[PDB]
């Protein structure tokens, strides 16, 4: 039926209004034309979309062992945003798990490419030095 509404469990054809972000389905709407009972997620919960969820989702903690830091706090409609402190880049282990690493400074060298969001600094060593996987080591 209408995208923005969903079918009532115990009675096909009574397409209730879905709950929008920040709230959750507390009770299915009573009859056609009647408001669906949605309620605001408690602090720590969130829903970032059209839903008819019976509970709100827990806000994510950032992975401290991965050196992550929380960029944005969690709100009733936007989940926690994690990242790294600038001067650090991200290395993705999986499409969701990234570890934060410190950017190389290029000691005993010159910055060839500056550090990126998902890439370490590329250095060029000074004559007399070997670039041994992102560090210049003397010959």
């Amino acid at each position: 039926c209408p995208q923005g509404k969903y079918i009532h469990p115990q009675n096909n054809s009574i397409c209730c209004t879905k709950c929008h972000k920040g709230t959750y389905l507390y009770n299915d709407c009573p009859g056609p034309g009647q408001d669906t009972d949605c309620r605001e997620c408690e602090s720590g919960s969130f829903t970032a979309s059209e839903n008819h969820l019976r509970h709100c989702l827990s806000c994510s903690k950032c992975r401290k062992e991965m050196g992550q830091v929380e960029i944005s706090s969690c709100t009733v409609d936007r989940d926690t945003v994690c990242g790294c402190r600038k001067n650090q880049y991200r290395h993705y282990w999986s499409e969701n798990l990234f570890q934060c690493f410190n950017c190389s400074l290029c000691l005993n060298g010159t910055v060839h490419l500056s550090c990126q969001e998902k890439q370490n600094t590329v250095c060029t060593c000074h004559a007399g030095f070997f670039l041994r996987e992102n560090e210049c080591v003397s010959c």
Binding site: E42, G44, S45, H55, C56, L57, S58, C59, S60, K61, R63, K64, E65, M66, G67, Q99
Partner: protein, 144 residues
């Protein structure tokens, strides 16, 4: 009939508190939560289960010397005996490497003959290292 599924509360940083008001957690048919324990509503056979996931990353050489003991366990407190009794225990010893983060998962579940009124609770050695999320740290039971 009775069943419960609980998740570790991710807002409590230093303790392991179970809750049932978010995500896919729930209580039905008589199961309830007092003092962080599940109260068995009627006598019968129940399948009881729990999972924990731990992580860490030794920052200094001092931390790489001695191992870390990690354990999770489900205990029972019945009127039949004055003491807490372990029903399930999972253990692991971790040897942290300097700067390399470690990740481990432990799971356990079994069936028991419980009596109405009994209390089910968990004890964890390694709380500061739990990866608290609804899909990683949970505890539950259901009547067969």
């Amino acid at each position: 009939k009775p069943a419960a599924h609980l998740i570790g509360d991710p807002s409590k940083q230093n303790s392991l508190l179970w809750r049932a008001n978010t995500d896919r957690a729930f209580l039905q048919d008589g199961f309830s939560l007092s003092n962080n324990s599940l109260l068995v509503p009627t006598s019968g056979i129940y399948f009881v289960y729990s999972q924990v996931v731990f992580s860490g990353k030794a920052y200094s050489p001092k931390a790489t010397s001695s191992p870390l003991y990690l354990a999770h366990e489900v205990q029972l407190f019945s009127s039949q005996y004055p003491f807490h009794v372990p029903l399930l225990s999972s253990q692991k010893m971790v040897y942290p490497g300097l700067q390399e983060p470690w990740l481990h998962s432990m799971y356990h579940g079994a069936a028991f003959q419980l009596t109405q009124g009994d209390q089910l609770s968990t004890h964890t050695d390694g709380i500061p290292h739990l990866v608290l999320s609804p899909s990683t740290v949970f505890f539950g039971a259901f009547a067969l």
